[PDB]
Amino acid sequence: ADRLFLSATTDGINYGREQMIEQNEPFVYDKRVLWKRVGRIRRLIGFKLRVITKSPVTLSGCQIRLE
Amino acid sequence: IVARTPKKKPFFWPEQIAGFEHMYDGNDDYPYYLLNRTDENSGDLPTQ
Amino acid sequence: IVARTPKKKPFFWPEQIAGFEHMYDGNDDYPYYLLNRTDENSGDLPTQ
Amino acid sequence: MQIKTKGDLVRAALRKLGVASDATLTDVEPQSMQDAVDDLEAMMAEWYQDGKGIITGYVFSDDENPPAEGDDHGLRSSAVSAVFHNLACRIAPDYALEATAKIIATAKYGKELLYKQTAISRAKRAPYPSRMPTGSGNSFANLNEWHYFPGEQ
Amino acid sequence: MQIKTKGDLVRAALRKLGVASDATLTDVEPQSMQDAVDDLEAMMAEWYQDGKGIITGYVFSDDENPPAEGDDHGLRSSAVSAVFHNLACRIAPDYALEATAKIIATAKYGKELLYKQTAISRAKRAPYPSRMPTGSGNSFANLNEWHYFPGEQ
Amino acid sequence: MQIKTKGDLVRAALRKLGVASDATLTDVEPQSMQDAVDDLEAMMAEWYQDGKGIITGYVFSDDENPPAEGDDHGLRSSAVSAVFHNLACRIAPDYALEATAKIIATAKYGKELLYKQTAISRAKRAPYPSRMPTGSGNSFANLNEWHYFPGEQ
Amino acid sequence: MQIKTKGDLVRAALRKLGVASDATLTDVEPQSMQDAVDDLEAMMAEWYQDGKGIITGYVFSDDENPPAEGDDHGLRSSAVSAVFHNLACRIAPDYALEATAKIIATAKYGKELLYKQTAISRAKRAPYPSRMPTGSGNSFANLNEWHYFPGEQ
Predict the structure, then answer these.
(1) What distance in Å separates the CA atoms of residue B36 and residue G45, rounded to the nearest whole number?
(2) Which of E104, E116, E121 is the best substitution to test chain B (most B C-beta atoms within 10 A)?
């Protein structure tokens, strides 16, 4: 059950804290990968999706509820 | 009719007098009667 | 009925008389009775 | 009742809100559980008001036990359906969700039945005033020089 | 109670508003925390009215101790659920946010519960007027030459 | 009645909401059934209020037998049409659905019919007060020196 | 209180309006500070109208000190939460911004709380009229030939 690291930038250069979410399970074919709270954005924000695996990784479609 | 008929007393909700329940017993130690107003889910339904 | 019945006294909210609580005891020292108006969350609900 | 633990209350509230359940594939995140249990403990403190308020079987954690999620609650079987409904109503502003009207109605009903028994039990009539004579029909307290009522004392 | 410090009140208010919590990716800058705790101190100073207004266990910071966030607040466990809800209602104009109706209702309920006990305790009846005779039934104060009531004084 | 077990109640509620039935191609996962039967148990224990509320034939699981979904319920045939309708009305917040107005009206009717018989049976008139003479027309209780009524006691 | 200086009041008002704060990355421009402090001084004169108005501890600058932003104000700790809220309500016309309803409600509450104590202190009853006899029960002012009340004088 490999995990995923995501973080956010406010200035676009250096990143914040890395949150660990599992994105893959050895024999589960249906699961949701999401984070329930991201918080206020002051001026601007950008995300990152570091993954460390030795198994195929597929990601398609990132959506956020802006308000 | 005189014996078994209930007397005259006000109709209160259990939460219109949530507190202040020792004021309506007839002790006659307070200058006025109190009723709470606000509610958690509903806004201010209890009335005077 | 004469003995145990509560007397006649007004119904006040605890915050209609937030202050001014020494005016309603019967001291008879002020020319009028006062009631505060505004509320922090609600606009002006307390009344005369 | 299968809802013995506070974590069961939190999970039921979250499932009612639609945040985390099994009818939706999402799962509970631990920090959400911690925030919700803190909110539950704070809300249950206000209702009690040290007794003067709603009286229900509830044990407040002294924090000697570090994890407050696992410990048991003393809630009787009737108050459970109200406590987690109110908790789910209160948690919704933490996210951007708003509770459905059915949850609000159920919370109202639950609190009303929570307080109705105490309201019945606390409706007592004051004793006779101090200057109330006892009539000549008693014939025993009248012969014992006990003419007048003691009073409210 | 896990909300011992003033900073805990500020963080609870921010979490209730949804701006920031422990599970959020972006966090609030400390100067905003300082502003929020200053606003909390100002709001608590306005309710006390110097002994005349709402009375609750609260200790105002000294200034001899630099950090006003760290020092503990003498709030009793029942007042917490009201204080940070009101703080979250007041902080909303600082950002572009507006408080949800549930938070407003909770703040109303909390302030009502804060003031109800003091309202009960302060409802006292004034003594007899100065020119009010005591009847011939006392038989002791009447025989001690003290025929009339003393007065409000 | 073909609705003997609690699981039958849960499945009837789910069918009424349209989420899942026998003729559907997708079904509900058993953990949601467990959650729904727990919710049904909680709701039914809040109507009983320990013998002081709505009284209907119902047996609570003792938790010694593991599956509370499989065991029988003591509901009479008339109360079934109310219990699962109310259960379906309560379940919809768990999903994203909202109960149709027809289901709400049916639940109202069912609860009213549930409580009407107990309301009839519980409308009793109190005995005569303590200080009430029995007139000279009884001629037997008057001759037995028992002139006054005993009282409510 | 950490809001000792008039500049602190101006900064708090601007932060409440959302013009310049740290929760919004903007910074305060000095001419905005000067305009806001001039408006604050103007507003707090119309309130204490030479004494016959709202009485609060406040020192009006004689302009001997050129920079009026840095000097202290004599506001008591309870009036601060009202003064800067009213200032923030007044400043918004300077820009195209409109104050939020929460700020307006807080300003109303603050002004009412400011004036209630003076209203209590100024509610005095007039003396007896000049042509009012003092009855024969005084027995001392009656013996001192001072039969009638002196009057309002």
Answers:
(1) 39
(2) E116
Residue of E nearest to A43 (CA): E26
Classify strands A19-22 and C11-12 as parallel, antiparallel or unpaired. unpaired
Q: Which amino acid is at D39?
A: D
The H or E element that residue G118 is part of is helix G101-121
Distance CA E45, CA E47 (A): 6
Q: CB of D41 within 8 Å of any CB in chain E?
A: yes
Q: Which residues of E touch B44 (CB under 8 A)?
A: 108
Chain B residue nearest residue F125, CA to CA: B4
Question: What Å distances lie between residue E33 and E69, E97, E103, E153, CA to CA?
Answer: 8, 17, 20, 50
Q: Nearest CA to F49 among D72, D115, D45, D104?
A: D115
Give the CA distances from residue A36 to residues A33, D18, D30, in Å, rounded to whole numbers and listed in that order.
Answer: 10, 12, 12
The alpha-carbon gap from C32 to the nearest alpha carbon of chain E, in Å, equals 17
Q: Is the backbone of residue D53 left (phi > 0), alpha (psi -120 to 50) or beta?
A: beta
To probe the interface with E, which of A5, A21, A35, A37 has the most E CB atoms within 10 Å? A37
Rounded Cα–Cα distance for residues B14 and D53 (Å): 13
Q: CA angle G56-G58-G61, nearest 5°?
A: 155
Exposed, middle or buried: residue D95 (CB in 10 Å: 0-12, 13-18, 19+)? Answer: middle
Report how far apart the first and last C-alpha atoms of chain C are (Å, whole number).
32
Instruction: Give the C-alpha separation, E22 to E75, whole Å.
Output: 23
Q: Are A67 and D96 in contact (CB < 8 Å)?
A: yes
E64 CA: distance to closest CA in chain D (Å): 31
Tokens of G115: 């004036």
Report how this structure was experimentally obtained: cryo-EM
Interface touch G23/A42, C-beta < 8 Å: yes
Which chains contact E through at least 3 pairs of Cβ atoms less than 8 Å apart? A, B, C, D, G
The counts of H helices and E strands in chain F are 4, 0
CB crowding F8-27: b at 16 or more within 10 Å, else e: bbbbbbbbbbebbeeeeeee
Q: Is A50 helix (H, G, I), strand (E, B) or coil?
A: strand
CB E149 within 8 A of CB E134: yes
Contacts A–G by Cβ distance under 8 A: 4
Q: Find the residue in G nearest to C22 (Cα).
A: G120
CA distance G126 to C31: 8
Q: At what angle do helices F30-47 and F80-91 cross, to 10 degrees?
A: 120
> Helices (DSSP H) in chain D: which residue ranges?
6-17, 30-48, 80-91, 101-121
Q: Which residues of B touch C1 (CB under 8 A)?
A: 7
C-beta of residue F73 within 8 angstroms of C-beta of residue F9: yes
Given phi > 0 = left and psi -120 to 50 = alpha, else beta, which region is E86? alpha
Kindly report the nearest CA distance between residue G95 and chain E, in angstroms.
16
- Start-end of H helices in F2-151: 6-17, 30-47, 80-91, 101-121
Cβ neighbours of residue B6 closer than 8 Å, sequence gap 6 or more = none
Cα separation, E9 vs E40, whole angstroms: 9
